């Protein structure tokens, strides 16, 4: 019930921390599941 939950969010001055799968799809953020559950770094010499 989109507008109801929205009304509730506004009146709470809520922050969407963007952790749920739904929220991340909304904002275009890579999902928190899966191959996304860790970071990759490169070992560089010199």
């Amino acid at each position: 019930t989109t507008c109801q939950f929205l009304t509730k969010a506004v009146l709470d001055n809520e922050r969407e921390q963007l952790d749920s799968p739904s929220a991340r799809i909304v904002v275009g953020k890579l999902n928190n599941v899966g191959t996304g559950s860790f970071d990759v770094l490169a070992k560089v010499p010199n």
Binding site: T35, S37, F38, D39, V40, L41, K43
Partner: protein, 100 residues
């Protein structure tokens, strides 16, 4: 301005305290099936854009296959940063993880 610097140093310090001592690591010493796939894909991506390559191509034209080869010889200069659910993390080098 002086104190944003301080703020950043605190953020980055606590992040590392999540991201943790090497000798206090506690997760699996095996590379996960997920870590493997992403390591391959990402290293393949870097190969496709002229990353220095650490192995003999021997005629290979598929950058994924080149990555696989690099993985096999443990010459992939990537590090996996594993996040525990509180946001603290362990850094594991691709070479040190047991691959299978």
């Amino acid at each position: 301005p002086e104190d944003f610097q301080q703020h950043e140093q605190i953020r980055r310090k606590t992040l590392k305290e999540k991201a943790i001592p090497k000798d206090q690591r506690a997760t699996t010493p095996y590379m996960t099936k997920y870590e493997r796939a992403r390591i391959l894909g990402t290293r393949a991506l870097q190969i496709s854009m002229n990353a220095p390559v650490f192995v003999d191509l021997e005629g290979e034209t598929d950058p994924l296959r080149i990555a696989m080869k690099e993985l096999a010889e443990k010459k992939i200069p990537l590090v996996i940063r594993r996040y525990l659910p509180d946001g603290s993390f362990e850094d594991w080098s691709v070479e040190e993880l047991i691959v299978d």
